[PDB]
PDB file of C-alpha atoms in Angstrom:
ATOM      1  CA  UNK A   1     -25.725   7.943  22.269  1.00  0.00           C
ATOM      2  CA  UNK A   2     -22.823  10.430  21.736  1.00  0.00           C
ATOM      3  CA  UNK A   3     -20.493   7.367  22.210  1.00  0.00           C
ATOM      4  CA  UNK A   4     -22.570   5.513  19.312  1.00  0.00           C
ATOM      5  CA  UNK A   5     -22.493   8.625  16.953  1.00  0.00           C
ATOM      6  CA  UNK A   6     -19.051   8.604  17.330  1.00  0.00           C
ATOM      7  CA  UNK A   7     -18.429   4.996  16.621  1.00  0.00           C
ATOM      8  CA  UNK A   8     -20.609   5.954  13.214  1.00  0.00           C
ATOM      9  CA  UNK A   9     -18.785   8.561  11.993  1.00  0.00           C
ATOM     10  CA  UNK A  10     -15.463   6.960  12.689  1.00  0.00           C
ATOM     11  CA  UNK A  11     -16.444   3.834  10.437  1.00  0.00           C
ATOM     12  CA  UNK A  12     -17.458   6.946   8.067  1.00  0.00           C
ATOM     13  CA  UNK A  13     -14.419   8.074   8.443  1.00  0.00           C
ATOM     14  CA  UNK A  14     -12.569   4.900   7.154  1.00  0.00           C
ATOM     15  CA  UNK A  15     -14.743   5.185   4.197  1.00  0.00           C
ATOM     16  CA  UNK A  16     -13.666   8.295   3.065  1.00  0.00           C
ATOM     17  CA  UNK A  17     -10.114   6.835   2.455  1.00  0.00           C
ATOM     18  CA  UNK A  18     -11.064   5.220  -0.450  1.00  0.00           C
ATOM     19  CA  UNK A  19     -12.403   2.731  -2.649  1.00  0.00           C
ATOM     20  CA  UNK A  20     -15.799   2.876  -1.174  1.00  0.00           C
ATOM     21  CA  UNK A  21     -17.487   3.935  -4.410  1.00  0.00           C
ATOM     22  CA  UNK A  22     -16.731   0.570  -6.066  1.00  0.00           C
ATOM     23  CA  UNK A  23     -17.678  -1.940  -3.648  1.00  0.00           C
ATOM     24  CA  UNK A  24     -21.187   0.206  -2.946  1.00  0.00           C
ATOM     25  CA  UNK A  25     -22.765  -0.394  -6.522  1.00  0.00           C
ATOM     26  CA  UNK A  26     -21.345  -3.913  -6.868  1.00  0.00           C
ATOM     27  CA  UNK A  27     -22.585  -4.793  -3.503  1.00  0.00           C
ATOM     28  CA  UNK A  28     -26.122  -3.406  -3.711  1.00  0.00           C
ATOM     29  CA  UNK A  29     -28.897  -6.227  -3.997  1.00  0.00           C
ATOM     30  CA  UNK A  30     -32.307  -6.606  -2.947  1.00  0.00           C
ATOM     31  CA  UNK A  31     -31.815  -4.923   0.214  1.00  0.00           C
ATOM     32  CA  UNK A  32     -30.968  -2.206  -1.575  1.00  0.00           C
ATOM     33  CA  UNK A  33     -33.809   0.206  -1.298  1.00  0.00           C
ATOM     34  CA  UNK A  34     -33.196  -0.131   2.496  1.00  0.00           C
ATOM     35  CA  UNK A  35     -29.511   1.036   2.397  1.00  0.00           C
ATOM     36  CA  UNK A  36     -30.211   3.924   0.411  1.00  0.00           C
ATOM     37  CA  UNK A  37     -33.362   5.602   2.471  1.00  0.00           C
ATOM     38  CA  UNK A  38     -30.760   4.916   5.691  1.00  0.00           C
ATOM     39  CA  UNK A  39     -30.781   8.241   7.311  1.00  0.00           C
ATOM     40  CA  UNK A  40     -27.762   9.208   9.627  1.00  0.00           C
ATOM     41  CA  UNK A  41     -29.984   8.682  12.735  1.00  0.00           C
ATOM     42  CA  UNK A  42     -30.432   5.285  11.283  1.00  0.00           C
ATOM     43  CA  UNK A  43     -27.086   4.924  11.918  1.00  0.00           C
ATOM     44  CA  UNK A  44     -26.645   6.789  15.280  1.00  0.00           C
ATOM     45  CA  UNK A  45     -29.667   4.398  16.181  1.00  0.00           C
ATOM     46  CA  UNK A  46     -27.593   1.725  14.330  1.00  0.00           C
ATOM     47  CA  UNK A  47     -29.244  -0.651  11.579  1.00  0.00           C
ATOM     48  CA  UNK A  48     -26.263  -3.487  12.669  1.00  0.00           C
ATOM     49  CA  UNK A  49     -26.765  -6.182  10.124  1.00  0.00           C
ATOM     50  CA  UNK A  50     -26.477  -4.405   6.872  1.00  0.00           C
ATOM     51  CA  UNK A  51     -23.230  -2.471   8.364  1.00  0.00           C
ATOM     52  CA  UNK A  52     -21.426  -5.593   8.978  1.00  0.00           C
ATOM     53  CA  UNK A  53     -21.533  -7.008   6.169  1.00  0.00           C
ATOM     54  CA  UNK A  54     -20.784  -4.111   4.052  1.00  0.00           C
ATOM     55  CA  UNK A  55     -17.437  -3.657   6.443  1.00  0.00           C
ATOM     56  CA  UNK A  56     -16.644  -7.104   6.142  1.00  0.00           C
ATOM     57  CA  UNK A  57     -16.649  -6.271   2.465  1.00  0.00           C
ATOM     58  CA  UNK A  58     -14.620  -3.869   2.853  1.00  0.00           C
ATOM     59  CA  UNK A  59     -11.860  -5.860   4.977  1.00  0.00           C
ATOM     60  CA  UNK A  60     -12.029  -8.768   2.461  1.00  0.00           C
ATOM     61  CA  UNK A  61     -11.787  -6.731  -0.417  1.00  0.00           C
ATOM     62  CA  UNK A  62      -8.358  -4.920  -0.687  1.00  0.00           C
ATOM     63  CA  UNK A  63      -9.928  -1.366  -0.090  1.00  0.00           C
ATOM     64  CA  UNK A  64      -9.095  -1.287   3.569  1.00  0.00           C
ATOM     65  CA  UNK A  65      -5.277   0.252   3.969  1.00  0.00           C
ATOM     66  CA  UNK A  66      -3.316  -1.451   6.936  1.00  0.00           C
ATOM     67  CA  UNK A  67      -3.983   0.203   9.922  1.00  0.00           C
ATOM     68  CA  UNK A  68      -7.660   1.272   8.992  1.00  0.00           C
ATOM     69  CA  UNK A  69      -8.232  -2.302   8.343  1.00  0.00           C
ATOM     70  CA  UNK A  70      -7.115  -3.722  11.692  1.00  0.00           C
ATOM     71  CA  UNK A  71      -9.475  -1.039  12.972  1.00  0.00           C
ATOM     72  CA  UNK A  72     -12.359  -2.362  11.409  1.00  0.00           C
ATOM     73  CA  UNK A  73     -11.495  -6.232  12.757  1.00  0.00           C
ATOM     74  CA  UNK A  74     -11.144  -4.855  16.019  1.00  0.00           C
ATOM     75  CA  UNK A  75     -15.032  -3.349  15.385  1.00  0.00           C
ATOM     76  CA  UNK A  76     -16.715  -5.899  14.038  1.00  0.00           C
ATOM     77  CA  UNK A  77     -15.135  -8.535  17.600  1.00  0.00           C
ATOM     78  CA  UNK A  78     -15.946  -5.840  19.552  1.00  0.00           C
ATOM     79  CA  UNK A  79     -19.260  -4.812  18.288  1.00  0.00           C
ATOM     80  CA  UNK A  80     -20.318  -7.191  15.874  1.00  0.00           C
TER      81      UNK A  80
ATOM     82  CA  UNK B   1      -3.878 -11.368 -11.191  1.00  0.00           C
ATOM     83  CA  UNK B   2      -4.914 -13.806 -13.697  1.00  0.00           C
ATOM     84  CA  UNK B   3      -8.630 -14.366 -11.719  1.00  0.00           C
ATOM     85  CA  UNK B   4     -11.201 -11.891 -11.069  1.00  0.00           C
ATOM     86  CA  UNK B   5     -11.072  -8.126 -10.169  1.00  0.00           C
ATOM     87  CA  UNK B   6     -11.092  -4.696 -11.783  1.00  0.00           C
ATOM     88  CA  UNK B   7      -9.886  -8.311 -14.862  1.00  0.00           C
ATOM     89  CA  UNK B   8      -7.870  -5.547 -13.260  1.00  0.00           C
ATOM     90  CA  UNK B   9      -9.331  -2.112 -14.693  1.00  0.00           C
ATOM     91  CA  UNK B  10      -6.199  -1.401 -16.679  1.00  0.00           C
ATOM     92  CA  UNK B  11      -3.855  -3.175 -19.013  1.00  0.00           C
ATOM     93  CA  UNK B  12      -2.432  -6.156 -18.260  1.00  0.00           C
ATOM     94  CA  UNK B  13       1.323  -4.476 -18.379  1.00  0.00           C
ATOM     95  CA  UNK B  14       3.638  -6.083 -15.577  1.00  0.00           C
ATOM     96  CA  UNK B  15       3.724  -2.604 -13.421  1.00  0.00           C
ATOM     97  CA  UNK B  16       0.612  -2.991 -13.608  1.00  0.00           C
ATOM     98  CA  UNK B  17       0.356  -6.285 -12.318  1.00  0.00           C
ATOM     99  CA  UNK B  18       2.340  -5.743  -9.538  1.00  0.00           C
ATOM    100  CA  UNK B  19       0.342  -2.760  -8.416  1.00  0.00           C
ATOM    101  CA  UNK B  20      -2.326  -5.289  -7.879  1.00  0.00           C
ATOM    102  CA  UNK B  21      -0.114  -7.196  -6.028  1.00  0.00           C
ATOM    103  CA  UNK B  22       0.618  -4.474  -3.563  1.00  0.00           C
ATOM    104  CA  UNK B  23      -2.687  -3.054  -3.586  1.00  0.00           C
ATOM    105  CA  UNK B  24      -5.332  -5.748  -3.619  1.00  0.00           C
ATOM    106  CA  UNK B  25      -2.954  -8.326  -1.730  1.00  0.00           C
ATOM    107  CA  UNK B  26      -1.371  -7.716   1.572  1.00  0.00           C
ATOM    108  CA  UNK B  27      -0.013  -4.534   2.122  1.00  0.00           C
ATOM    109  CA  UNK B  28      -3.989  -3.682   3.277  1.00  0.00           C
ATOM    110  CA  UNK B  29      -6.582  -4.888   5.513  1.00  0.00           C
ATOM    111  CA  UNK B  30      -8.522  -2.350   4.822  1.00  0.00           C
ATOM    112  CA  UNK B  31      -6.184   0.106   3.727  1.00  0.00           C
ATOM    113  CA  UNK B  32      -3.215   2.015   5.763  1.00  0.00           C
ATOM    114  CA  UNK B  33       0.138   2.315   7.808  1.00  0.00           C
ATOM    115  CA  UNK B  34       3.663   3.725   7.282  1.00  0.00           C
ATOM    116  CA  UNK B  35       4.179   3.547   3.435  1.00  0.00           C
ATOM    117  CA  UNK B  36       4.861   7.112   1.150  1.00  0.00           C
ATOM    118  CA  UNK B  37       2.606   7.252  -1.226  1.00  0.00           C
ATOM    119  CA  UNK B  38       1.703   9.434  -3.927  1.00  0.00           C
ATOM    120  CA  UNK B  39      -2.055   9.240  -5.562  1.00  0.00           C
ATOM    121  CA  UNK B  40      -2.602   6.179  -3.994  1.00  0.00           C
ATOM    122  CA  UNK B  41       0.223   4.191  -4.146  1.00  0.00           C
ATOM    123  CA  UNK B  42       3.292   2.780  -2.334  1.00  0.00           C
ATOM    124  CA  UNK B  43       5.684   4.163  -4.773  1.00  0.00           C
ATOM    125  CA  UNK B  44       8.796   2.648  -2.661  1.00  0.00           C
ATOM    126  CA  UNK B  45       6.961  -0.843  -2.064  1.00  0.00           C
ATOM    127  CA  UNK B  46       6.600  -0.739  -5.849  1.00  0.00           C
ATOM    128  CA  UNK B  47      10.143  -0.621  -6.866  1.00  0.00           C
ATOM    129  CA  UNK B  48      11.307  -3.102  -4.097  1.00  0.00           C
ATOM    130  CA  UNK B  49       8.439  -5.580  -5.977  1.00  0.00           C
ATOM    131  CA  UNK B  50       9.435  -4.751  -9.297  1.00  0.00           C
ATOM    132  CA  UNK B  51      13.067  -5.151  -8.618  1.00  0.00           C
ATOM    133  CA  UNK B  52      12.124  -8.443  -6.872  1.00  0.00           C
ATOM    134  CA  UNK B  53       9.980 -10.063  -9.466  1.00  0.00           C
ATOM    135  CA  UNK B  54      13.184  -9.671 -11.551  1.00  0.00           C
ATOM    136  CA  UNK B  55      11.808  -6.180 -13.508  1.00  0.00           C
ATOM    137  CA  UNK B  56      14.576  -3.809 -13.026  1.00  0.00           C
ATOM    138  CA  UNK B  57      13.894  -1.473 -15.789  1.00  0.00           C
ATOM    139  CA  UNK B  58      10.683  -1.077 -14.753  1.00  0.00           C
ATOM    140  CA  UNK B  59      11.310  -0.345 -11.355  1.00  0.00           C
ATOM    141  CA  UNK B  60      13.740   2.034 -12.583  1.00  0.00           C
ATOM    142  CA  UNK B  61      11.129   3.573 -14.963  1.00  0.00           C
ATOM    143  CA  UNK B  62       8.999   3.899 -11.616  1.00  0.00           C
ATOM    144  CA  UNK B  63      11.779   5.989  -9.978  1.00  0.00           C
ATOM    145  CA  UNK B  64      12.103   7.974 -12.801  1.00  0.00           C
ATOM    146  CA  UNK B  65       8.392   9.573 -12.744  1.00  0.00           C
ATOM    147  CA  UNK B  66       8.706   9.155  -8.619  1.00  0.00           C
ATOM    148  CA  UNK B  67       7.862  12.993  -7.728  1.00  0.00           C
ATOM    149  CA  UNK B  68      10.793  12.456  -4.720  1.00  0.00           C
ATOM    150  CA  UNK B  69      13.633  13.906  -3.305  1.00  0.00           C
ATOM    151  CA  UNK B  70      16.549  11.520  -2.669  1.00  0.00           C
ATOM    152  CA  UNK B  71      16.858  11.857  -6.345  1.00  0.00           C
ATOM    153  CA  UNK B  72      20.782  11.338  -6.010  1.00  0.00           C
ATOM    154  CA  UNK B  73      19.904   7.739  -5.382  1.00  0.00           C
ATOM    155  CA  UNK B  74      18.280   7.996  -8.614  1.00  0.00           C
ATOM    156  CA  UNK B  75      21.094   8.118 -10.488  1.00  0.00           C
ATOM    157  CA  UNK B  76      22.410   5.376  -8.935  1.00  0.00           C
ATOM    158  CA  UNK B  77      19.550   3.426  -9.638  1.00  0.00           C
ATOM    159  CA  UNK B  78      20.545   3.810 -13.548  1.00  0.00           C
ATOM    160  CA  UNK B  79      23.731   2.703 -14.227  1.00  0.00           C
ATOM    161  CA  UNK B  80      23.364  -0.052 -11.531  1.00  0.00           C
ATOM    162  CA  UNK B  81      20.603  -0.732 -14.168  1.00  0.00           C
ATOM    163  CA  UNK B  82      22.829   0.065 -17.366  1.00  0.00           C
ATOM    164  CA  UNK B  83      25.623  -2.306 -16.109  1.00  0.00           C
ATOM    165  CA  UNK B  84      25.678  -6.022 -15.169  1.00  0.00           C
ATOM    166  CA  UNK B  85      24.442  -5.155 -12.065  1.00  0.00           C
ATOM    167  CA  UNK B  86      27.137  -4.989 -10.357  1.00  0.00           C
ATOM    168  CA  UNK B  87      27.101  -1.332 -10.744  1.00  0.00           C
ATOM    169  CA  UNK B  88      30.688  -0.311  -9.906  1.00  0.00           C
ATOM    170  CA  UNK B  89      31.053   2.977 -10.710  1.00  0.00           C
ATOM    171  CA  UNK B  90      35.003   4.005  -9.697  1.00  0.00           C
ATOM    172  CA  UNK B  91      32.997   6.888  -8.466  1.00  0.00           C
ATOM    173  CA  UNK B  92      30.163   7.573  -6.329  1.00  0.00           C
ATOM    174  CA  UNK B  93      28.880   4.313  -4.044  1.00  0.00           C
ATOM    175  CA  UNK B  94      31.623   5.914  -1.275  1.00  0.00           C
ATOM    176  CA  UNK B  95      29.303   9.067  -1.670  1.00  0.00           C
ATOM    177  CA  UNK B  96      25.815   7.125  -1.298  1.00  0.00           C
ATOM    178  CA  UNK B  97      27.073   5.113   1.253  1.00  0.00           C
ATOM    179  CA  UNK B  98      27.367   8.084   3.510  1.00  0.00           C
ATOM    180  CA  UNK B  99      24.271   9.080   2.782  1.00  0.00           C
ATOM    181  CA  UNK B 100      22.610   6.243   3.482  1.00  0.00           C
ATOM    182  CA  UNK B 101      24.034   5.682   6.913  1.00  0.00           C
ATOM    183  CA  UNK B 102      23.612   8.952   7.979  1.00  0.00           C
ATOM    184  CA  UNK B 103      20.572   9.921   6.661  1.00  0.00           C
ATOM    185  CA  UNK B 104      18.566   6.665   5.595  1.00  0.00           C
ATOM    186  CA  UNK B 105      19.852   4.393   7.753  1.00  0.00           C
ATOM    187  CA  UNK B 106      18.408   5.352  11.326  1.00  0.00           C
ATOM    188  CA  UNK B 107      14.785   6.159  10.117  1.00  0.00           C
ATOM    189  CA  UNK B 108      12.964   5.746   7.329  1.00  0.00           C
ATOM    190  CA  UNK B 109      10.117   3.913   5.108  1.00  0.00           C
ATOM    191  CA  UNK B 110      11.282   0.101   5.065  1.00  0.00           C
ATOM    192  CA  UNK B 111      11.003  -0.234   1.076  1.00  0.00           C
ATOM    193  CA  UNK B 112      12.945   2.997   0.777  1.00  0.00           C
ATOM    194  CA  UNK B 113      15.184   1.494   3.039  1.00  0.00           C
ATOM    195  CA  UNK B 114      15.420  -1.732   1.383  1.00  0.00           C
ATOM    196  CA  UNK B 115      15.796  -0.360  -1.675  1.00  0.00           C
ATOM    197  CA  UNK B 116      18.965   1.144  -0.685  1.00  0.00           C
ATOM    198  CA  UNK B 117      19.963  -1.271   1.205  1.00  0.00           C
ATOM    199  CA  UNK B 118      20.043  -4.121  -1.682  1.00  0.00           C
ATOM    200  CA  UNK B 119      21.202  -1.897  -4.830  1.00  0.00           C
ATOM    201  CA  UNK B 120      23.886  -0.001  -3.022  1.00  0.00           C
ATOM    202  CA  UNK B 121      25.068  -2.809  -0.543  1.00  0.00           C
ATOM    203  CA  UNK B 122      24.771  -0.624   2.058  1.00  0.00           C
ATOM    204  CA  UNK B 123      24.964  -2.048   5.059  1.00  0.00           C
ATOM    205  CA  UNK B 124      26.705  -5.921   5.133  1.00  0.00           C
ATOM    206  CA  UNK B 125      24.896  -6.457   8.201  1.00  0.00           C
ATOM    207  CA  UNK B 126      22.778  -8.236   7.145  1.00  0.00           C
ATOM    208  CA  UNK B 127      18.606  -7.719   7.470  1.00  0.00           C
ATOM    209  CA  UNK B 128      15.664  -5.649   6.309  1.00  0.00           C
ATOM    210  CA  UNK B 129      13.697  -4.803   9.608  1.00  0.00           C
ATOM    211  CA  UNK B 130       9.703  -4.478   8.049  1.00  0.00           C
ATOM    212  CA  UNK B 131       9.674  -5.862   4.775  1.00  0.00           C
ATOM    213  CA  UNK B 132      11.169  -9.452   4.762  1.00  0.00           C
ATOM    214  CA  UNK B 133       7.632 -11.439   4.568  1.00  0.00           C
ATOM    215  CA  UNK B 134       8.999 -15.006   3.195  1.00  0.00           C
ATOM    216  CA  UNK B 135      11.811 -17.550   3.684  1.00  0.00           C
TER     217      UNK B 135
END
């Protein structure tokens, strides 16, 4: 579990760089109303699906910045 | 540029263009590594582009607002600019030479580097270590 939280916050982390804004309210569908009631236990007790695709987003979009973005390829083959 | 984005959010202006380049193309994965940048951007990566797409002024425009500290080199940029381009001053290129290989040389940020490198004719050995992407 502390392992998982960690994993978490470090994608969170990558977020914060930038252009996260953006992508969210472009990206946002249906599914929506899921994402947003997604408490931080959710993602401690990970909701996997909706993550990836939101991170592959935000490889293949130009928001990811060199080394964070190698980070997140290295995620999704190791846990994804 | 010309398909999809933002349609970049600004104007269509060449620096502009280029910023794209750098941003949305290549330089990031997923953004990150190595580069100096200032309020989000590679300001060195955006001369060396400028200056390679052929759009000196700009680049030297780019310089100009840079918020840096080299800013000798920056007068050398102009007046490499203001000439032919073969910016032979009688004077100073002996001085920024030294600089360069002392300081620069053994170091540094590869556009900075490159950006040396190519306007002052640094080095004639010949090679830019990070930033030569294409035959």
């Amino acid at each position: 579990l502390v392992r998982k939280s960690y994993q978490a916050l470090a994608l969170w982390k990558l977020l914060c760089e930038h252009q996260f804004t953006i992508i969210v309210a472009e990206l946002q569908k249906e599914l929506q109303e899921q994402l947003k009631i997604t408490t931080f236990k959710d993602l401690v007790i990970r909701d996997k699906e909706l993550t990836g695709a939101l991170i592959a987003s935000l490889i293949n979009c130009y928001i990811r910045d060199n080394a964070a973005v190698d980070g997140i390829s290295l995620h999704l083959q190791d846990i994804c | 540029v010309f398909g999809n984005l933002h349609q970049l959010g600004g104007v269509p202006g060449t620096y502009q263009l280029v910023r794209s380049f750098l941003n949305i193309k290549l330089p990031a994965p997923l953004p990150g590594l190595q580069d100096g940048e200032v309020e989000g951007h590679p300001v060195w990566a955006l001369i060396y582009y400028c200056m390679r797409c052929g759009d000196l002024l700009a680049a030297s425009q780019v310089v100009n607002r840079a918020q840096h500290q080299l800013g000798e080199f920056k007068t050398w940029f102009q007046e490499y600019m203001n000439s032919k381009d073969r910016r032979l001053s009688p004077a100073t290129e002996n001085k920024l030479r030294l600089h360069y290989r002392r300081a620069l040389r053994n170091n540094t940020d590869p556009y900075k580097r490159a950006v040396y490198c190519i306007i002052g004719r640094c080095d004639v050995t010949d090679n830019q270590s990070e930033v030569a992407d294409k035959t």
